[PDB]
Symmetry: C3
Amino acid sequence: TINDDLEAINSELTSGGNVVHKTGDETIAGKKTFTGNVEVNGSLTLPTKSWSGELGGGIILSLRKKGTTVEYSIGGEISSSILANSNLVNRSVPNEFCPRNRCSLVGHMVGGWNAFHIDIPSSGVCQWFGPTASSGTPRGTGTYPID
Amino acid sequence: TINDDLEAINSELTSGGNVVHKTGDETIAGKKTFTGNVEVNGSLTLPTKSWSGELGGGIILSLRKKGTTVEYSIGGEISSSILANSNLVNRSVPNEFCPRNRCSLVGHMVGGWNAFHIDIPSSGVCQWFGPTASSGTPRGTGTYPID
Amino acid sequence: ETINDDLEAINSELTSGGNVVHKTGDETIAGKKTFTGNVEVNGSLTLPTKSWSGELGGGIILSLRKKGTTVEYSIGGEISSSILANSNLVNRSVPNEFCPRNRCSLVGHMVGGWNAFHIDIPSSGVCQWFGPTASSGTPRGTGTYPID
């Protein structure tokens, strides 16, 4: 009957089926391109992964990728002589956190005016571009892009 | 009439009702999980809040949270002796802007080669990790995560 | 009849196409969409992107990529002539599209020692050097600033 057809269609308009609704928890497949403005009042969750390791010389790099941006924080303490303009060779940054282009991450040494930077190239073999140093507490928080 | 039933259904499928459409400004409740890729051509807007305050010693920290990322801008002008490795005790960063993990925000002093950093711990009691300084113009723009 | 003509159209749009967003399919969606709840994206989330690179002045190169209203920067090049403290960098301005509403200070570091500087991008895009007067060295630094 026409009533039976309408009833089933009405159901789809309310919830379920293959239509996205203005209410309800829903899972949505397909590439969705929004051409206007999108606002999210709740949380926005993207794929995330974290890693932390000692790059070299006592310097620790802690990373968290959210989509295609990596959050970094530099930690640790210089506990052996790190030579000027040298490769940090204890651990490389894993491939999933390596950028397409070399990024230069600026940091600061606790208690004075001294700054350094560490490069992360696409290989993940990071490089120290301060001078030769054998002590101190390096710090710095920021982001770099993966893409 | 059956035709009126059918036409009212069609109306819902083209605007309004509980259906999300490919045109029109719409408000959408429920947890929506996109299992594929999403592209936004307009703006993407997340919950946003701003705060600025004098942490201590003439240093002003200006913050704007967008979702779970905080944009920071270090400003002001040193107006008293800010001691090396010191708590900034004029104003704490409000809880809403305090990170889960202590972040180190690298800055630079106008007119020379001098860098510092300011830590924002989970408590919001910020700390200056330059050396003792009683003058200068501190600056630096970046981000840190809340989560 | 008219009934089946109507039901054809309705059934069609309930499955794909039409002006309905579906739980499958590659679709383009116009209008401001406000999600009052939580949103998760399991794939990629892509925003409008544009890139620009130019020599600001004195050999210093700024490479920029805007993703939405955030600009990714990387400082490059090499100081190859005298740049005075507090001076405008007048070889190239940052294009309007990448200029911030609020002045940003981009901290950098000079290769091989402990020296830091910063470069401001004012709303005008006429960048300013806030290191000391300098005529040599390799400036670097990667970060972000907001346009809005």
